[PDB]
Amino acid sequence: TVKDVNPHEFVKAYSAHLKRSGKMELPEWVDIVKTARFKELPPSDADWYYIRAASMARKIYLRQGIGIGGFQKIYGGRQRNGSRPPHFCKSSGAVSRNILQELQKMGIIDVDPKGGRLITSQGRRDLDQVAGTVP
Amino acid sequence: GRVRTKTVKKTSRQVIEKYYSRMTLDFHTNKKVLEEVSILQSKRLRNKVAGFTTHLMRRIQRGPVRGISLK
Amino acid sequence: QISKKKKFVSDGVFYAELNEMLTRELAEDGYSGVEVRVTPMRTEIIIRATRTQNVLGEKGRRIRELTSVVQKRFNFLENGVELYAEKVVNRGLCAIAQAESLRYKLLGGLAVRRACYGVLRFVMESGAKGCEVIVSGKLRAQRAKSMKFKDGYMISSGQPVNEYIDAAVRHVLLRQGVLGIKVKIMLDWDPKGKLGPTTPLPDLVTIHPPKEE
Amino acid sequence: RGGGKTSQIYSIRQAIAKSLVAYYQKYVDEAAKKEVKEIFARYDRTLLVADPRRCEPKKFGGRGARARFQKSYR
Amino acid sequence: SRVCRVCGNSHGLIRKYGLMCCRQCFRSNAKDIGFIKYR
Amino acid sequence: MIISKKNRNEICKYLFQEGVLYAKKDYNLAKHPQIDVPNLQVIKLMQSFKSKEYVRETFSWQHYYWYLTNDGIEFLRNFLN
Amino acid sequence: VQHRIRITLSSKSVKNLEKVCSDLVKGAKEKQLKVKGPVRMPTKVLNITTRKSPCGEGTNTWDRFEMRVHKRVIDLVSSPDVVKQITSITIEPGVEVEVTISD
RNA sequence: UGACAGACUGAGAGCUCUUUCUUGAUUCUAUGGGUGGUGGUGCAUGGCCGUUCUUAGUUGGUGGAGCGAUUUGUCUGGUUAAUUCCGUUAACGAACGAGACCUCAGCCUGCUAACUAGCUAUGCGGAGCCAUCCCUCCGCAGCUAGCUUCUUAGAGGGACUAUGGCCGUUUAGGCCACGGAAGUUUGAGGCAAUAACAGGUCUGUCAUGCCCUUAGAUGUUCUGGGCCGCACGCGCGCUACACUGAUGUAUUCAACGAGUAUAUAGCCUUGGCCGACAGGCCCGGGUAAUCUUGGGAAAUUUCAUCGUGAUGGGGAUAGAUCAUUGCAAUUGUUGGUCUUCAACGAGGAAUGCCUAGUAAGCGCGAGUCAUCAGCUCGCGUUGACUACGUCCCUGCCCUUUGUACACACCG
Ligand SMILES: [Mg+2]
Ligand SMILES: [Mg+2]
Ligand SMILES: [Mg+2]
Ligand SMILES: [Mg+2]
Ligand SMILES: [Mg+2]
Ligand SMILES: [Mg+2]
Ligand SMILES: [Mg+2]
Ligand SMILES: [Mg+2]
Ligand SMILES: [Mg+2]
Ligand SMILES: [Mg+2]
Ligand SMILES: [Mg+2]
Ligand SMILES: [Mg+2]
Ligand SMILES: [Mg+2]
Ligand SMILES: [Mg+2]
Ligand SMILES: [Mg+2]
Ligand SMILES: [Mg+2]
Ligand SMILES: [Mg+2]
Ligand SMILES: [Mg+2]
Ligand SMILES: [Mg+2]
Ligand SMILES: [Zn+2]
């Protein structure tokens, strides 16, 4: 299944799935937002939203009940403060919330009582289907 | 540097004198014997005193020796 | 509701504050310790001193006052906090009482060396392994000097210092300056527990004599 | 679990090695576990024995176990 | 607006765990409170 | 010190019932517990009774412990009792 | 008639705590009660590092102070009166006894 | 004694004045005397700390030598990290320091246990699939455990140089080696002698002598300013000078700690929604192995973009603007957004720290704290080069020796 495929080629395969599998909405700020306070430029690849989606539905598929203030820590990283020492900074909550809301508006994941987000039965199904098709 | 100090050396000789018969040439049994005859405040002190008594018996079983007076 | 960390820290702070109080009142009384034992519904606070009559006073008016004010300051439930007055088993093996004695002799005007050897001899006659008395300050002169009086066994490094040494520091407000008294007392091995520590010195050996049959 | 990436890899190494030794100990044979023990312990003695090396604590007067703050005289 | 409970001083105050003592009074009373020097 | 007769009256009645008293050093606390007064007067009339040895004082390291004395109980009885 | 009684003990000294902790367990072993304990919880070390000098001169040297706090739990099934019969023996100084009723 | 309206005032200080209500022996006036003082003096002191001093050193009793100061003991030699030990011996017998000791880390499928730690099996739930079962990956619940390996913390055990070889009075010891978790005292700390310093601290202490002041105050409190000012010299540092890299994806592995009734949701904050960020609103947990937090850290790994260019290295200086904390942010508290793109091309003479999970690299926690960490104290992560010596330089210990030094060669 998903743990038998390398997580790089799998995310490439899934992020190609959501592309040619129907569609989802895409905000009217996707081309301008940096995805993190500490980032320097927006994501280099124009097809990053889908990557960020395919990489992100694998998080809920291997875990259970992850909020947004946990995804911000997931995709946060090192922030360099110029002449002061660098520290750890969290990414932006707007993209994190929006991709989950879209996965809801496709039925891959759903919000969870007791808080958090959980993979759906059908969302589990297509992830293992696509996993079956990765070299 | 593993020089044994005065307490260990003195106690080793002075326990050799009192019980020559109940000691032997094995370290471990000598450990137990020394635990059955004297009151020491650390396991490391016991292991050190028993280690100095065991080769003292090896050289006693070899030949003569200084101040300890075996009957 | 209070956590465990803050509970234990407050307990220790209470004991520190209480003792640093009770060393002001029971000064010319031989004060020698306080112990806070907590029972259900009650907290016993055994004061111990060398002259229990003095802390008790006349028909216990002083102990009544102490109980009442300890209750009121530290917001104990009323009638929940009580004080007692035990007496130190050996006055001559406690450096708090001995330092206070020396303090009072000094402030009386007694010559320094006479008082210090008096303290020394009393501690040695009460069965202590050794004693050390340090007196420091302006003794007879404008330059400060210190005199050390020693006797018997005395150890200063390692772990047993904590359990085999009883030490006390006390100021003297003699005219024209301040004197410092340091009293160190080496206690002796007492498996009973009444007079000294139970565990022997880390370098001490006991070969049972070779019984014969 | 625990440690870092290299430390986890070495822990897993030791896990396969000691697990195989214990399996041949308890279920296969005492002689053919000696075999595999000798092949494992001729290559590297720390597929079976772990490193007692730990991170030495830090002491004041410098930022590190052994390093000290740079000293200036004038 | 935050002083040592033992001396009412304003510098080197230890507010951790709720002590509220200055760094010198805490040293003088550390053993009585129960803080042991192990290492 | 300028204190109303009512305020000192309550300081003496509370000094009566138990005989013991404490303040803190916090100056201008503005409401002593156990009795109604800004905690300045309490200190400042114990500062009088100490001078007349009606009360024996322990500075308690700047925190003010007061115990009524056999000499001052006889004075204070003729005052509110 | 049988509840779920949890008795929690805290101390600064290991041995004085473990004496009482064993005493309770054995006092509840004579009554053929279900004693699920003692459960040991991670020692909490309260640490304060302070400069030795009062005046800031010389080598900067520190002393690290520590309070170890130990947390034991004993589990019982009984009525609160039988346990109060048991947790009424002589308790060493410094030990906290804080019996409650779990859900 | 308290107070209205204007002046007085920064002031809504009845401070002071115009006006006369209010209040009653608490006050006022002088003498005396106390009191306060982060006032002076650390060269009057106490306590504490640092250093001499990281080394092995120090001292009585009795006896010996000397007129005496003094000396021996406390030593020729071997040995030790050690005034450690063997031994020698006008000394014998002892006291401290070293060691022992205590803390942490290292081993234990052995003991005690554990629903506030989990692993295992079985059941039900999902998803894949030669599909019906089996197989794999997760979820969930218990009277599953002949469960405690992993986690926690208690009791103990374990190493003693024990065994072997060689060197050595073939003593004390030393080197080598199998074994072993471990064979530098296993590693790292805590503790730590005599004698001393005119070392630092009166600005920690209602610790303190003396002096000074004590009302027109050096007391206390309020308001505002400074402590941060800037031609310049110095010390600890942070960021770098790039490709063994920067940027942008994907990927994802720790430990030590922390969480005051914190007001009526409040300290740490999960979860949901709004927002590009900053930040906000709502429903909540936790006084805690229970909730934050299996602490989903960074360096690192991965695939792209850059291409030897003061470049996309570097991020100083500065403009505009938003938000947060706080009673108040101005000489910007701090955090965001866009813009501005300085020196710096691996650094002269000099100089510091370092011998293994160490140096160095990387981030995290706590202290300070309403807000502010380039600091300090800890913690894990990645993990080497070199040496296994010497007394050349800087010093230290012991002996012999010279001395016109004794405040002692800074003589
Ligand atoms: Mg860096
Ligand atoms: Mg002032
Ligand atoms: Mg001085
Ligand atoms: Mg001094
Ligand atoms: Mg002599
Ligand atoms: Mg003589
Ligand atoms: Mg003579
Ligand atoms: Mg050591
Ligand atoms: Mg001082
Ligand atoms: Mg001001
Ligand atoms: Mg420095
Ligand atoms: Mg850049
Ligand atoms: Mg990168
Ligand atoms: Mg500031
Ligand atoms: Mg901080
Ligand atoms: Mg600082
Ligand atoms: Mg000459
Ligand atoms: Mg001369
Ligand atoms: Mg010269
Ligand atoms: Zn203080």
PDB file of C-alpha atoms in Angstrom, chain G residues 39-88:
ATOM      1  CA  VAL G  39       2.974   2.475  40.660  1.00  0.00           C
ATOM      2  CA  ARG G  40       6.057   4.676  40.322  1.00  0.00           C
ATOM      3  CA  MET G  41       5.899   7.951  38.508  1.00  0.00           C
ATOM      4  CA  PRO G  42       8.877   9.802  37.029  1.00  0.00           C
ATOM      5  CA  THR G  43      10.877  11.556  39.698  1.00  0.00           C
ATOM      6  CA  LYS G  44      10.412  15.303  39.482  1.00  0.00           C
ATOM      7  CA  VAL G  45      13.654  17.192  40.037  1.00  0.00           C
ATOM      8  CA  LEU G  46      13.125  20.854  40.862  1.00  0.00           C
ATOM      9  CA  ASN G  47      16.359  22.579  39.894  1.00  0.00           C
ATOM     10  CA  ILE G  48      17.649  26.080  40.586  1.00  0.00           C
ATOM     11  CA  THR G  49      21.121  27.187  39.517  1.00  0.00           C
ATOM     12  CA  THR G  50      22.490  30.139  41.445  1.00  0.00           C
ATOM     13  CA  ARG G  51      25.695  32.133  41.504  1.00  0.00           C
ATOM     14  CA  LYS G  52      27.651  31.418  44.656  1.00  0.00           C
ATOM     15  CA  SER G  53      29.053  34.913  45.013  1.00  0.00           C
ATOM     16  CA  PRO G  54      26.863  37.667  46.500  1.00  0.00           C
ATOM     17  CA  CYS G  55      28.778  40.445  44.760  1.00  0.00           C
ATOM     18  CA  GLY G  56      29.730  39.411  41.229  1.00  0.00           C
ATOM     19  CA  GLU G  57      33.525  39.295  41.546  1.00  0.00           C
ATOM     20  CA  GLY G  58      36.005  36.586  40.638  1.00  0.00           C
ATOM     21  CA  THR G  59      35.477  33.467  38.625  1.00  0.00           C
ATOM     22  CA  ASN G  60      31.798  33.000  37.854  1.00  0.00           C
ATOM     23  CA  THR G  61      30.975  29.767  39.676  1.00  0.00           C
ATOM     24  CA  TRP G  62      27.513  28.273  40.037  1.00  0.00           C
ATOM     25  CA  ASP G  63      25.879  25.814  42.377  1.00  0.00           C
ATOM     26  CA  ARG G  64      22.992  23.683  41.159  1.00  0.00           C
ATOM     27  CA  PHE G  65      20.334  22.979  43.782  1.00  0.00           C
ATOM     28  CA  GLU G  66      17.828  20.170  43.400  1.00  0.00           C
ATOM     29  CA  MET G  67      14.750  18.804  45.142  1.00  0.00           C
ATOM     30  CA  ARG G  68      13.753  15.290  44.161  1.00  0.00           C
ATOM     31  CA  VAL G  69      10.020  14.613  44.498  1.00  0.00           C
ATOM     32  CA  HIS G  70       8.698  11.060  44.214  1.00  0.00           C
ATOM     33  CA  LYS G  71       5.144  10.085  43.284  1.00  0.00           C
ATOM     34  CA  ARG G  72       3.701   6.684  44.214  1.00  0.00           C
ATOM     35  CA  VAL G  73       0.184   5.408  43.580  1.00  0.00           C
ATOM     36  CA  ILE G  74      -1.683   2.518  45.191  1.00  0.00           C
ATOM     37  CA  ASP G  75      -4.947   1.167  43.805  1.00  0.00           C
ATOM     38  CA  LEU G  76      -7.631  -0.518  45.910  1.00  0.00           C
ATOM     39  CA  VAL G  77     -11.175  -1.820  45.655  1.00  0.00           C
ATOM     40  CA  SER G  78     -13.067  -1.356  48.916  1.00  0.00           C
ATOM     41  CA  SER G  79     -15.365   0.958  50.772  1.00  0.00           C
ATOM     42  CA  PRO G  80     -13.742   4.184  52.048  1.00  0.00           C
ATOM     43  CA  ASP G  81     -14.098   3.107  55.674  1.00  0.00           C
ATOM     44  CA  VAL G  82     -11.970  -0.042  55.378  1.00  0.00           C
ATOM     45  CA  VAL G  83      -9.222   1.954  53.674  1.00  0.00           C
ATOM     46  CA  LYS G  84      -9.483   4.705  56.311  1.00  0.00           C
ATOM     47  CA  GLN G  85      -9.018   1.878  58.809  1.00  0.00           C
ATOM     48  CA  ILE G  86      -5.867   0.919  56.901  1.00  0.00           C
ATOM     49  CA  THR G  87      -4.537   4.424  56.158  1.00  0.00           C
ATOM     50  CA  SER G  88      -4.529   5.339  59.831  1.00  0.00           C
TER      51      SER G  88
END
